[PDB]
DNA sequence: AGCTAATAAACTAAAAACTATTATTATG
DNA sequence: TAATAATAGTTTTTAGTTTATTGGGC
């Protein structure tokens, strides 16, 4: 297939004036039409290109035309694209500061394209614009445009951020687009382009008003240039009457590259070094090299492997006969198998041209089997390179010339008979109107179709058919991603494949609702072994970070280590190491500083209180003076409320000997320090009369009272 | 599945054989070897994995492992091998005759107490996996016992008790086949088809265990182990063995790219890809090529449901695969499906997924259908009711419409071809065919051990014939002609 | 009257399923 | 003291490249 493409691109940034989820159309377009010249060049397919510009910030096209063609910048001419091109158009084309009429870059294009019509051989002219509606509209040019379309016969495909045919998704439907809802300007472009491109294609105009999402998404421009199916020179023939040529045409394919990733040496980069060497050496204990034409090919045959030659099997073998076709059987519609099917491709087949005769007999054919839903079957000897094939063909329904295709049937070699137990009578499991309620819940919760009307035939709101292999456009991806940039690794997650492909939110939240009590009516467990096996892409979370030890360059780090592997020193040890958050070690060490003054021994008190009395210190110069009074305030009633004579009198002897408050919570140490005092005590309560225990005490009370 | 089934051919060492015995056609000894040759191709063609063997029970010239007398062992329990093929051959017709003359002789007494014993003991010898046993035993008498009834009872005795052991057994009928004659020691216990037993396969190699198995998920929470099998594919090839000149050996295929730099050695580290894009260079390793070829883990998101309203007649990708809930690890399949099996016929709203076959692999859109029940009528559960996945075009895939486009022609001509449609019909035999052109090449490959030119050539009805059914459907369809001018030259 | 092009078949490696096995720890 | 258990060993597909090839010309 050849074409004539012009490209008429937009720079500006009101042209690029989105909103934050949605992304800017400028982008939109230059994603979908790198996407149009990678595909272009990738595949290895030639066009002329051109490169113009509206609402550049200056011009560069010198037609004048009295001052319309202003802004308008033309940078490429008429040569096969090119990845530079392209990393021109990804790099130089960025939205300006310039706004200029998008009829006007209209005018530009059927100029050029008028340019490159003048002897150059194409086989379809195409025009490529893309605007968001953020340019001046004109109607002086209606007719030009109008006789320059209908005369010149230039083919034209364009979208907008409104589809014409919730929540915000780049290639889904973000926010409602109301084209009425926008400035006015637009609308005009809007209303002015569509009846002029309904006006030049006719019917085919509707269907290409997409909002930039959903362009973004789905088919855009990928219909515009698409491979048409060729031609089949075939004839049918029935009985000895009648015979009729035919042309079969392919449906289904598996895509795929002509291309080899060309194996070339890493220290090279070429082919010439890995020049092709495959030996074959005789395989017992000696190897010895045999020489190729002396080769041998036997099959198995049994246990045994019998010696054949090639030529032999070359002559006897059996193969189709020509490149015929013909029906052979009959049986009506319904005894066909959803599931006993093959035919990796699917073939459509139909008159051969330039022959009403034949399409009026296969029309008058298809007739027959239709009004009687009949179905034949057809053998399918393509040619005499591959055996027959063989299967039913049925009849294709259509708006105009209907169809039939032929599919291939299982042959008895190549069925299984892996037979099972039917789960409709597996005792050990019922289906439960919870399970049954469970599956209802998304039944009607969930579904794809347009469900609104009967007259409404339903559709895919989210087509799927119309979404080609992602790996190819990820292969351009990467492909890109490498020539562009040789030195970049590969290129990122790029989310948006995922995005063509997810599921709608607003189907998926309303997924959401059900599902989650369905997973809770009935929970499942499963067995271990589910999981990757490697995950070794860096030792931690990351590399590592810059931190160091600093502020102690004294050069005595150790050479005199503080060696540490609580009378007096453990606790100012403890005390000195008040350096993180200086709260521990004290606030629970002073039962120690009890157990300690337990007054078995002298020292031990006196160790006791000197360790309270250096600890008053500590807590004055490491900022606990808060606590240090606190627990001033606590020791002298915590040693009162267990009244002995022997600790406390000492205690309060060597405190208001050496008590020394200075201000810490305020006056409260003052206060502390202004008062250290004794208390007299009063006699003995008796006043028992609840037992017996009163009578020793009244004998110690009478003896001696 | 693992097990290996048995078969042997069991005949009788006395005169019955070689007398046509009330028949005008070829002896039970002739037809015998003709049938059990022609069985034996084909099971040969069946399987290796597979042991075979026959003994002449009876003899005048003891010739067995355990030298028990009336007892000729001519096949060791063996797996098909083409000497033996080889050496089959040649029993055919009075030569043959005559060799069993030579080889035994012809006729000896029997006693099917030690008879059936040792064939027990043949059973017991091999140590291989084993799944399956049964006999093919030939007689012409409709009873050995015109003798004491010792024989009778003791055979019939353990004919029960290799019926426990579980032996299958099947009398032909060597004298007039069918007609209620052969029944009088075989009403009992004992456990026609003899050209359907030639007539019973042809050019198969059953398969088992069938592969591709993975996991399927509701949401992002929960994976459940189901199994899913293939029912059908493509006609496969036999690999063509490498042999030497003449001692016909293979030996070593070894690729090894040579360099032009030092006539050295290149490594596979040293290889990276290259893409030649006219200046533009495209050098990519082989891992990061292949991690290109990744999008996600292999798994299936369920989309959701949708209507009967796909299935549009333009598409059709790969056949679709057959599912069954299977508790590899997940604990608990199909009792999540319970519920959906009966929810086929009151619910066609079908779901889809995209699949992911493994990494490395494209994610797959793909759409199923839950799958139902036609248990036969001998209670033959074929397509046991579980899922079928099918594909779905992607937008690459589907091809352009035929630009000419208009609308249909007159039903005048329908009325003509009225009669040539209803005339000629066949019954839609799925079953009608295999692929004839396959078979032929094991046809020849195989003949080159009996050197015949090439074995049994079928065509079966499967190509139109321009005159027999031509004129099967009738002249009417060549008198039926309305569309002036066949455009034909 | 000189000229060649998509292509299934053929040819590959590639990953897998299912078998069938073997270290591995309680146990003494 | 010794049962148990992740494990690779054979094929089987399957898909990517390789091939020799009628097709029309003028």
Known sequence: NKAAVVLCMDVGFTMSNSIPGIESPFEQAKKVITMFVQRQVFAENKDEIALVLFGTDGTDNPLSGGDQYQNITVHRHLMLPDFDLLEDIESKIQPGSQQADFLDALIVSMDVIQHETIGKKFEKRHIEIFTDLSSRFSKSQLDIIIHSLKKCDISLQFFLPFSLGGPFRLGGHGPSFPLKGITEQQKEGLEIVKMVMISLEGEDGLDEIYSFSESLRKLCVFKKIERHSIHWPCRLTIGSNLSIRIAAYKSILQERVKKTWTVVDAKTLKKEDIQKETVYCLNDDDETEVLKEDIIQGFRYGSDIVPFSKVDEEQMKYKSEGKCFSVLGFCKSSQVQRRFFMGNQVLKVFAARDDEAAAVALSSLIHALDDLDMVAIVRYAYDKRANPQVGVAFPHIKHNYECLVYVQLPFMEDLRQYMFSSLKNSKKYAPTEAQLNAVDALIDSMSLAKKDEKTDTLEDLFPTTKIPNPRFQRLFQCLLHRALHPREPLPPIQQHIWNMLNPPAEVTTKSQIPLSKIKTLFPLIEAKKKDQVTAQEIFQDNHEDGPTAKKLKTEQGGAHFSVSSNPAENFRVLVKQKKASFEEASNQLINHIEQFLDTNETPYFMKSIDCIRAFREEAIKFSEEQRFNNFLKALQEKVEIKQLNHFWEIVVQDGITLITKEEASGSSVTAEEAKKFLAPKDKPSGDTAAVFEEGGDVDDLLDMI | ?489
């Open chain 2, 1 to 489: 599945y693992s097990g290996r089934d048995s078969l042997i051919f069991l005949v009788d060492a006395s005169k019955a054989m070689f007398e046509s015995q009330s028949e005008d056609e070829l002896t039970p000894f002739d037809m015998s070897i003709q049938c059990i040759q022609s069985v034996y191709i084909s099971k040969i063609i069946s399987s290796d994995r597979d042991l075979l063997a026959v003994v002449f029970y009876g003899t005048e010239k003891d010739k067995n492992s355990v030298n028990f007398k009336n007892i000729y062992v001519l096949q060791e329990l063996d797996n098909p091998g083409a000497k033996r093929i080889l050496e089959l051959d040649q029993f055919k017709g009075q030569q043959g005759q005559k060799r069993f003359q030579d080889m035994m002789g012809h006729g000896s007494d029997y006693s099917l107490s030690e008879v059936l014993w040792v064939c027990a003991n043949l059973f017991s010898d091999v140590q291989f996996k084993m799944s399956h046993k049964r006999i093919m035993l030939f007689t012409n008498e409709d009873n050995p016992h015109g003798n004491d009834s010792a024989k009778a009872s003791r055979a019939r005795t353990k004919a029960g008790d290799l019926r426990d052991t579980g032996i299958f057994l099947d009398l032909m009928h060597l004298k007039k086949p069918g007609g209620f004659d052969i029944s009088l020691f075989y009403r009992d216990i004992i456990s026609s088809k003899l050209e359907d037993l030639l007539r019973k396969v042809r050019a198969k190699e059953t398969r088992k265990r069938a592969l591709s198995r993975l996991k399927l998920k509701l949401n992002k929470d929960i994976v459940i182990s189901v199994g899913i099998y293939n029912l059908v594919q493509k006609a496969l090839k036999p690999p063509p063995i490498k042999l030497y000149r003449e001692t016909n050996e293979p030996v070593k295929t070894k690729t090894r790219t040579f360099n032009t730099s030092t006539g050295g050695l290149l490594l596979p580290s040293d290889t990276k890809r290259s893409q030649i894009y006219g200046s533009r260079q495209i050098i990519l390793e082989k891992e990061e090529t292949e991690e290109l070829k990744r999008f996600d883990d292999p798994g299936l998101m369920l989309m959701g449901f949708k209507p009967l309203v796909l299935l549009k007649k333009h598409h059709y990708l790969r056949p679709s695969l057959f599912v069954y809930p299977e508790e590899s690890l997940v604990i608990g399949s199909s009792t999540l499906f319970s519920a959906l099996l009966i929810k086929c016929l009151e619910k066609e709203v079908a779901a889809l997924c995209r699949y992911t076959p493994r990494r490395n692999i494209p994610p797959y859109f793909v759409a199923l259908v839950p799958q139902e029940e036609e248990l036969d009528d001998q209670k033959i559960q074929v397509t046991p009711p579980g899922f079928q996945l099918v594909f779905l075009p992607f937008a690459d895939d589907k091809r352009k419409m035929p630009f000419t486009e208009k609308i249909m022609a007159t039903p005048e001509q329908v009325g003509k071809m009225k009669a040539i449609v209803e005339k000629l019909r066949f019954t839609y035999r799925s079953d009608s065919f295999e692929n004839p052109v396959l078979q032929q090449h094991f046809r020849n490959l195989e003949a080159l051990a009996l050197d015949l030119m090439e074995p049994e050539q079928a065509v079966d009805l499967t190509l139109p014939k321009v005159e027999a059914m031509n004129k099967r459907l009738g002249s009417l369809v060549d008198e039926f002609k309305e569309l002036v001018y066949p455009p034909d030259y």
